[PDB]
Amino acid sequence: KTRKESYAIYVYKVLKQVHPDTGISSKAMSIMNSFVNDVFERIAGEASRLAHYNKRSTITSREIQTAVRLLLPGELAKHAVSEGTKAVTKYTSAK
């Protein structure tokens, strides 16, 4: 049949996590995927840009790390890094 994949499974549990027996319209659901896919290119594209400025050829986590910092304002940014840094840190701990 057709494809047209989306992030619907990811957005839904997140909302469950923050009000479990709280609801949503089928119109705000796409707004959400539209919103995510939009932020996706915003961050990953910028990573691509720096990589081939100061003369290197792969994109790691550090770059995102840097990228994120100047893409967003002071207070959210730090918490965001923190969360980000740990999630992965744990990831490696396992293996």
Q: Residue 90, interface with DNA (CB under 7 A)?
A: no
Residue 61 found at the interface with DNA (CB under 7 A): no
Check residue 20 for interaction with DNA (CB under 7 A). Answer: yes
On whether the CB atoms of residues 43 and 67 are closer than 8 A, the answer is yes
User: What residue spans of the chain are helical by DSSP H?
Assistant: 8-18, 26-51, 61-71, 74-93
Based on C-alpha coordinates, what's the Rg of the chain?
17
Q: Does 94 bind DNA (CB under 7 A)?
A: no
**Nearest distance from C-beta of residue 40 to DNA, angstroms:** 13
Q: Note the residues at the interface with DNA (CB under 7 A).
A: 3, 16, 20-24, 51, 56-58, 60
